[PDB]
Design an enzyme around this catalytic site. Structure first.
Site, PDB file in Angstrom:
ATOM      1  N   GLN A 105       0.725  -1.102  -0.039  1.00  0.00           N
ATOM      2  CA  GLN A 105       0.126  -0.049  -0.056  1.00  0.00           C
ATOM      3  C   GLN A 105       0.952   1.366  -0.010  1.00  0.00           C
ATOM      4  OE1 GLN A 105      -2.821   0.792   3.267  1.00  0.00           O
ATOM      5  NE2 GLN A 105      -4.271   1.625   1.673  1.00  0.00           N
ATOM      6  N   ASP A 108       2.462   1.610  -3.491  1.00  0.00           N
ATOM      7  CA  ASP A 108       1.322   2.111  -4.544  1.00  0.00           C
ATOM      8  C   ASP A 108       1.166   3.590  -4.381  1.00  0.00           C
ATOM      9  OD1 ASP A 108      -1.603   2.845  -4.777  1.00  0.00           O
ATOM     10  OD2 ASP A 108      -1.768   0.766  -5.762  1.00  0.00           O
ATOM     11  N   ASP A 110       2.935   5.872  -3.236  1.00  0.00           N
ATOM     12  CA  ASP A 110       4.160   6.591  -3.700  1.00  0.00           C
ATOM     13  C   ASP A 110       4.277   6.757  -5.179  1.00  0.00           C
ATOM     14  OD1 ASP A 110       7.718   6.712  -2.624  1.00  0.00           O
ATOM     15  OD2 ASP A 110       7.075   7.199  -4.599  1.00  0.00           O
ATOM     16  N   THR A 184       3.950  11.471  -7.781  1.00  0.00           N
ATOM     17  CA  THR A 184       5.215  11.380  -8.944  1.00  0.00           C
ATOM     18  C   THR A 184       5.353   9.839  -9.371  1.00  0.00           C
ATOM     19  OG1 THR A 184       6.762  11.226  -7.041  1.00  0.00           O
ATOM     20  CG2 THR A 184       6.460  13.365  -8.049  1.00  0.00           C
ATOM     21  N   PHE A 186       8.083   8.334 -10.037  1.00  0.00           N
ATOM     22  CA  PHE A 186       9.353   7.692  -9.420  1.00  0.00           C
ATOM     23  C   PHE A 186       9.065   7.227  -7.959  1.00  0.00           C
ATOM     24  CE2 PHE A 186      10.069  11.263 -12.328  1.00  0.00           C
ATOM     25  CZ  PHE A 186      10.761  10.515 -13.431  1.00  0.00           C
ATOM     26  N   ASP A 188      10.123   7.339  -4.916  1.00  0.00           N
ATOM     27  CA  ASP A 188      10.815   8.638  -4.263  1.00  0.00           C
ATOM     28  C   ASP A 188      10.597   9.018  -3.100  1.00  0.00           C
ATOM     29  OD1 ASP A 188       8.565   9.982  -5.340  1.00  0.00           O
ATOM     30  OD2 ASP A 188       9.363  11.332  -6.509  1.00  0.00           O
ATOM     31  N   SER A 190       7.513  10.366  -2.371  1.00  0.00           N
ATOM     32  CA  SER A 190       6.768  11.463  -2.454  1.00  0.00           C
ATOM     33  C   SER A 190       5.357  11.432  -1.398  1.00  0.00           C
ATOM     34  CB  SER A 190       6.075  11.778  -3.838  1.00  0.00           C
ATOM     35  OG  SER A 190       5.729  10.348  -4.446  1.00  0.00           O
ATOM     36  N   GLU A 258      -6.360   6.632   5.716  1.00  0.00           N
ATOM     37  CA  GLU A 258      -7.247   6.037   5.216  1.00  0.00           C
ATOM     38  C   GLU A 258      -7.475   4.352   6.272  1.00  0.00           C
ATOM     39  OE1 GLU A 258      -6.671   2.665   3.741  1.00  0.00           O
ATOM     40  OE2 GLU A 258      -8.683   2.090   3.057  1.00  0.00           O
ATOM     41  N   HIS A 351      -5.595  -5.752  -2.551  1.00  0.00           N
ATOM     42  CA  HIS A 351      -6.811  -5.619  -1.656  1.00  0.00           C
ATOM     43  C   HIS A 351      -7.164  -7.121  -1.086  1.00  0.00           C
ATOM     44  CE1 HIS A 351      -7.834  -1.484  -3.817  1.00  0.00           C
ATOM     45  NE2 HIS A 351      -7.084  -1.543  -2.826  1.00  0.00           N
TER      46      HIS A 351
HETATM   47  C1  HEM Z   1      -6.918  -1.672   4.328  1.00  0.00           C
HETATM   48  C2  HEM Z   1      -6.178  -1.352   3.516  1.00  0.00           C
HETATM   49  C3  HEM Z   1      -6.668  -0.638   2.130  1.00  0.00           C
HETATM   50  C4  HEM Z   1      -7.796   0.142   2.257  1.00  0.00           C
HETATM   51  C5  HEM Z   1      -8.786   0.638   3.163  1.00  0.00           C
HETATM   52  C6  HEM Z   1      -7.500   0.609   0.770  1.00  0.00           C
HETATM   53  C7  HEM Z   1      -8.530   1.295   0.100  1.00  0.00           C
HETATM   54  C8  HEM Z   1      -8.511   1.730  -1.083  1.00  0.00           C
HETATM   55  C9  HEM Z   1      -9.465   2.724  -1.461  1.00  0.00           C
HETATM   56  C10 HEM Z   1     -10.810   3.424  -0.936  1.00  0.00           C
HETATM   57  C11 HEM Z   1      -9.037   3.059  -2.851  1.00  0.00           C
HETATM   58  C12 HEM Z   1      -9.647   4.015  -3.811  1.00  0.00           C
HETATM   59  C13 HEM Z   1     -10.562   3.195  -4.814  1.00  0.00           C
HETATM   60  C14 HEM Z   1     -11.380   3.909  -5.650  1.00  0.00           C
HETATM   61  O1  HEM Z   1     -11.862   5.061  -5.886  1.00  0.00           O
HETATM   62  O2  HEM Z   1     -10.983   3.665  -7.074  1.00  0.00           O
HETATM   63  C15 HEM Z   1      -7.814   2.312  -2.948  1.00  0.00           C
HETATM   64  C16 HEM Z   1      -7.252   2.326  -4.087  1.00  0.00           C
HETATM   65  C17 HEM Z   1      -5.844   1.780  -4.487  1.00  0.00           C
HETATM   66  N1  HEM Z   1      -5.256   0.633  -3.475  1.00  0.00           N
HETATM   67 FE1  HEM Z   1      -6.073   0.398  -1.780  1.00  0.00          FE
HETATM   68  N2  HEM Z   1      -6.728   0.056   0.200  1.00  0.00           N
HETATM   69  C18 HEM Z   1      -6.061  -0.844   1.007  1.00  0.00           C
HETATM   70  C19 HEM Z   1      -4.886  -1.603   0.733  1.00  0.00           C
HETATM   71  C20 HEM Z   1      -4.064  -1.626  -0.470  1.00  0.00           C
HETATM   72  C21 HEM Z   1      -2.914  -2.473  -0.746  1.00  0.00           C
HETATM   73  C22 HEM Z   1      -2.436  -3.389   0.165  1.00  0.00           C
HETATM   74  C23 HEM Z   1      -2.716  -2.297  -1.888  1.00  0.00           C
HETATM   75  C24 HEM Z   1      -1.421  -2.750  -2.576  1.00  0.00           C
HETATM   76  C25 HEM Z   1      -0.366  -3.681  -2.143  1.00  0.00           C
HETATM   77  C26 HEM Z   1      -3.436  -0.911  -2.274  1.00  0.00           C
HETATM   78  C27 HEM Z   1      -3.319  -0.561  -3.695  1.00  0.00           C
HETATM   79  C28 HEM Z   1      -4.174   0.536  -4.003  1.00  0.00           C
HETATM   80  C29 HEM Z   1      -3.900   1.165  -5.498  1.00  0.00           C
HETATM   81  C30 HEM Z   1      -2.816   0.849  -6.554  1.00  0.00           C
HETATM   82  C31 HEM Z   1      -5.314   2.026  -5.562  1.00  0.00           C
HETATM   83  C32 HEM Z   1      -5.471   2.868  -6.699  1.00  0.00           C
HETATM   84  C33 HEM Z   1      -4.455   4.216  -6.414  1.00  0.00           C
HETATM   85  C34 HEM Z   1      -4.678   5.157  -7.363  1.00  0.00           C
HETATM   86  O3  HEM Z   1      -4.046   5.288  -8.699  1.00  0.00           O
HETATM   87  O4  HEM Z   1      -5.550   6.190  -7.384  1.00  0.00           O
HETATM   88  N3  HEM Z   1      -4.312  -1.128  -1.267  1.00  0.00           N
HETATM   89  N4  HEM Z   1      -7.505   1.634  -1.719  1.00  0.00           N
HETATM   90 BR   LIG Z   2      -7.090   4.913  -0.072  1.00  0.00          BR
HETATM   91 CA   LIG Z   3       6.583   9.078  -6.000  1.00  0.00          CA
HETATM   92 CL   LIG Z   4      -9.060   6.994   0.523  1.00  0.00          CL
END
Ligand code: HEM
Ligand SMILES: [Br-]
Ligand SMILES: [Ca+2]
Ligand SMILES: [Cl-]
Ligand SMILES: CC(=O)N[C@@H]1[C@@H](O)[C@H](O)[C@@H](CO)O[C@H]1O
Ligand SMILES: CC(=O)N[C@@H]1[C@@H](O)[C@H](O)[C@@H](CO)O[C@H]1O
Ligand SMILES: *[C@@H]1O[C@H](CO)[C@@H](O)[C@H](O)[C@H]1NC(C)=O
Ligand SMILES: *[C@@H]1O[C@H](CO)[C@@H](O)[C@H](O)[C@H]1NC(C)=O
Ligand SMILES: *[C@@H]1O[C@H](CO)[C@@H](O)[C@H](O)[C@H]1NC(C)=O
Length: 592
Positions: A105, A108, A110, A184, A186, A188, A190, A258, A351
C-alpha cells in the site's frame, strides 16, 4: 499531428543543470523530456483506452449498449457472486507477515493517485448522487442487484464519482479521456514529502534551520513524534468518533489516514527522516537546513527503493522476478518512467491480501489490553486509536507477528472491505472496495482481460473450457462466464486477480507481467535511482546496502525485538532477534 501531451494545466518547468536533488514535482528527471514521470499529468496508456462511445463514456453507462455484444454485469453483482466470502478461518498467508500487505500500500501510494472529480463546490450534485442515485456528469453510481442485502439497509446504490482527467475538468476536448496521476511516478518517497511544492513546504519545519519535517505539537508517542494533524474541517477522522475528536494526519499523501496501519507506516517514515537529519547535522554542523532536508530526503528515497526492489518485489513476482526485472545496468533515458493506467488496477492485488482484523501486541508479543484485536472496518480513517489508545508500537508489533491474508479464488476480499468500507465523504461503513475497483476499471476505460493477456503474450481464452484452463478453476470460470458472457469482457482487476499465483509469488502470470514491466520501467527510467552511477558515492552505496525494515523499526520505535526478514511470517520468540544485533545504517560516508 502528435502533440506530446495536454500541456495547458501545468507550465513547463526550467531544468537546473547541476540537479543534485530530485524536484518535488518529478519535473526534470528526464532532461530531454522534463515532464515525464512528473505529478499532475496523464497516466500513461500502454494500450488505447476503451470506452463505450470510444472517447469518455464508461462501459455500463448506457443500458441498451453492450461490450462486444453483451451487457457488462453490475460491479456489485460481480463482487457478491465472485469476490465475497464469510469464513475467515484458514485464509491467512502462512509465509507473509502483515507488513507485506502494508508495504504494498505504501509503494502504491508513492507511485499513483487518480483522485475523483471534486471540481469546486459540487456538493449539490454530490448529494444528488448519494441521495437520489442519479447517473450523470461525473456521477456514476454503483447500483445494487436484486436480492442485494444492502437494498434493505442502504437504498438503491453506492455513490461513485468519476476520476479526474487532463485538459478540461467539467467538459471535454476531443481526445480519449486520460485520467491524471496526482503523484510522482518515481519511487521517491513522495508519500512522505508531497508531490506539490505547496504541501512539501507545509510539511517541513522551516522554523529551525535543521531540515526537519513538522511533527505533532499536541501529542507524542512516549517521547516519539507523530505526524501533524490536518487542521481543516470536515475531518473524516473526527467524524468516526466525535468524542475523541482526533483529526486525520497531514502527510505527503492525502490518503495517509485511510487505515491505521497506513498511518503507522507513514509515522515510521517521518521519524526516519528526522532521525537522519539529526545524524547528518551531527556529522556536518556547517550544513544548512535545505541541505539537511535534501540529504535526508535522498536517503529515505533510497531506503524505499531498496526495500521495494530487494525485499518486496521478489516475493510478489516469485519465479517471474528475473524475467521482468533483470539486474540493474544503469539509467536508461529512453525508458518511459510514467505509471500506466493499467498498473493502478494491477497493483490493487493488495486488496485481496488484507485480513479482517488488526491486533495490538505488548512487549511479549501478547494481546495488548482487552480490545487487543480490532475488526478492520473500525480502523478506516481512525487516528484516535493511535493518539488515545497506545501509540504505534503495539500496531508495529502486530505488523511483524501477524500475517497477511492470502489471495484465494474462493475467498477474495474480506467483508471488512467488501461490505464495510468507509469513504471520506459519506457517513456509513457500508461501501464495497471490490465493486468500486470494477466501476473504476470502467471509469478509466480499461481494455478487457484478453486485451491484456495479448499485451503480455499469453493465451486469450474464448470459451468456458479455455477460461477454466487458464484460471485452473472450473467453478470460478463458470461464474465469470455467467456474468460476463465472454472472457473478452472480464474487467482486468478481477481477471488478473483470478489467476493462480506463480511459484514463490503472490500474483498470477498476467499481473506479474503488468507489475514487472512497470517496476522495471520506474527503476531503469529514473535518473535518481539510488544505484545509478553519480547519485550516491560508492561508500554511500555500500552503507545503503545494509538498510532493512527491521532496522527502521529498531531506530524509530520502542520495539527492541525484530525479525531479520520482516516480510516473511515470523513467530515470537523463535524468529525474533535483539535490535542490538541488527546492522545499522552507517552515515559516516556522508561527512563532508
Ligand atoms: C486496509 C487496506 C486498504 C484500504 C482501506 C484501501 C482502500 C482503497 C481505496 C478506498 C481506494 C480508492 C478506490 C477507488 O476509488 O477507485 C484504493 C485504491 C488503491 N489501492 Fe488500496 N486499500 C488498502 C490496501 C491496499 C494495498 C495493500 C494495496 C497494494 C498492495 C493497495 C493498492 C491500491 C492502489 C494501487 C489503488 C489505486 C490508487 C490510485 O492510482 O488512485 N491498497 N484503496
Ligand atoms: Br486510499
Ligand atoms: Ca512518487
Ligand atoms: Cl482513500
Ligand atoms: C529544542 C527546541 O528548540 N525546542 C522548542 C522549544 O524550546 C520551544 O518552546 C518551542 C517553540 O515552538 O519549540 C520546541
Ligand atoms: C481517552 C479516554 O477517555 N479513554 C477511554 C477509556 O478510559 C475507557 O476505558 C474506554 C472504554 O471503552 O473508552 C475510552 O474512550
Ligand atoms: C518464505 O518466504 C521466503 C521468501 O519467499 C522464502 O525465502 C522462505 O523459504 C519461505 N519459507 C517457507 C515457509 O516456505
Ligand atoms: C521545529 O523544530 C524546532 C527545533 O529545532 C522545535 O522547537 C519545534 O517544535 C519544531 N516544529 C514543528 C512544528 O515540528
Ligand atoms: C534503453 O531503452 C530503450 C527503450 O526501451 C531500448 O530500446 C534500448 O535497447 C535500451 N538500452 C539499453 C542499453 O538497455
Amino acid at each position: 499531428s502528435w502533440e506530446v501531451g495536454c500541456g495547458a494545466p501545468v507550465p513547463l518547468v526550467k531544468c537546473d543543470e547541476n540537479s543534485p536533488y530530485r524536484t518535488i514535482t518529478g519535473d526534470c528527471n528526464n532532461r530531454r523530456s522534463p515532464a515525464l514521470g512528473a505529478a499532475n499529468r496523464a497516466l500513461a496508456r500502454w494500450l488505447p483506452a476503451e470506452y463505450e462511445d470510444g472517447l469518455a463514456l464508461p462501459f455500463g453507462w448506457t443500458q441498451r449498449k453492450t461490450r462486444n455484444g453483451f451487457r457488462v454485469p453490475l460491479a456489485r453483482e460481480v463482487s457478491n457472486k465472485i469476490v465475497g466470502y464469510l469464513d475467515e478461518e484458514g485464509v491467512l498467508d502462512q509465509n507473509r507477515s502483515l507488513l507485506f500487505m502494508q508495504w504494498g500500500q505504501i509503494v502504491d501510494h508513492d507511485l499513483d493517485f487518480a483522485p475523483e472529480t471534486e471540481l469546486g463546490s459540487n456538493e449539490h450534485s454530490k448529494t444528488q448522487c448519494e441521495e437520489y442515485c442519479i447517473q450523470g456528469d461525473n456521477c456514476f453510481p454503483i447500483m445494487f442487484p436484486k436480492n442485494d442485502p444492502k437494498l434493505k439497509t442502504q437504498g438503491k446504490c453506492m455513490p461513485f464519482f468519476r476520476a479526474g482527467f487532463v485538459c478540461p475538468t467539467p467538459p471535454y476536448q476531443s481526445l480519449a479521456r486520460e485520467q491524471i496521476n496526482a503523484v510522482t511516478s518515481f519511487l521517491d518517497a513522495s508519500l512522505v514529502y508531497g508531490s506539490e511544492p505547496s504541501l512539501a513546504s507545509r510539511l517541513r519545519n522551516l522554523s529551525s534551520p535543521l531540515g526537519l519535517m513538522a511533527v505533532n505539537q499536541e501529542a507524542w508517542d512516549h517521547g516519539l513524534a507523530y505526524l501533524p494533524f490536518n487542521n481543516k474541517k470536515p475531518s473524516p477522522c473526527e467524524f468516526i468518533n466525535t468524542t475523541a475528536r482526533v483529526p486525520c494526519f497531514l502527510a505527503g499523501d492525502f490518503r495517509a489516514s485511510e487505515q491505521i496501519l497506513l498511518a503507522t507506516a507513514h509515522t515510521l517514515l517521518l521519524r526516519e527522516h528526522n532521525r537522519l537529519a539529526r545524524e547528518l547535522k551531527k556529522l556536518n554542523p556547517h550544513w544548512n537546513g535545505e541541505k539537511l532536508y535534501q540529504e535526508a530526503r535522498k536517503i529515505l528515497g533510497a531506503f524505499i527503493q531498496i526495500i521495494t526492489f530487494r525485499d518486496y518485489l521478489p516475493i510478489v513476482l516469485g519465479s517471474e522476478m528475473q524475467k521482468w526485472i533483470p539486474p540493474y545496468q544503469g539509467y536508461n533515458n529512453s525508458v518511459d518512467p510514467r505509471i500506466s493506467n493499467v498498473f493502478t488496477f494491477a497493483f490493487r492485488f493488495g486488496h485481496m491480501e488484507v485480513p479482517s482484523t488488526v491486533s495490538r501486541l505488548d512487549e511479549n508479543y501478547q494481546p495488548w489490553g482487552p480490545e487487543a484485536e480490532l475488526p478492520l472496518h473500525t480502523l478506516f480513517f481512525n487516528t484516535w486509536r493511535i493518539i488515545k489508545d497506545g501509540g504505534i508500537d503495539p500496531l508495529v508489533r502486530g505488523l511483524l507477528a501477524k500475517k497477511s491474508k492470502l489471495m484465494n479464488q474462493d475467498k477474495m476480499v474480506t467483508s471488512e472491505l467488501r461490505n464495510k468500507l468507509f469513504q471520506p465523504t459519506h457517513k456509513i461503513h457500508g461501501f464495497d472496495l471490490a465493486a468500486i475497483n470494477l466501476q473504476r476499471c470502467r471509469d478509466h476505460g480499461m481494455p478487457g482481460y484478453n486485451s491484456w493477456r495479448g499485451f503480455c503474450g499469453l493465451s486469450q481464452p474464448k470459451t468456458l473450457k479455455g477460461l477454466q484452463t487458464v484460471l485452473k478453476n472450473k467453478i470460478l470460470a463458470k461464474k465469470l462466464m455467467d456474468l460476463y458472457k465472454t472472457p473478452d469482457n472480464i474487467d482486468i482487476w478481477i481477471g488478473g486477480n483470478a489467476e493462480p499465483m506463480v511459484e514463490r509469488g503472490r500474483v498470477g502470470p498476467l499481473l506479474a507481467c503488468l507489475l514487472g514491466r512497470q517496476f522495471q520501467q520506474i527503476r531503469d527510467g529514473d535518473r535518481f535511482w539510488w544505484e545509478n552511477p553519480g547519485v550516491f558515492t560508492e561508500k554511500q552505496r555500500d552503507s545503503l546496502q545494509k538498510v532493512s525494515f527491521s532496522r527502521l523499526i529498531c531506530d524509530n520505535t520502542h520495539i527492541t525485538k525484530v525479525p531479520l526478514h520482516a516480510f516473511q511470517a515470523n513467530n515470537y520468540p523463535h524468529d525474533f532477534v535483539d535490535c542490538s544485533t541488527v546492522d545499522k545504517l552507517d552515515l559516516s560516508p556522508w561527512a563532508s
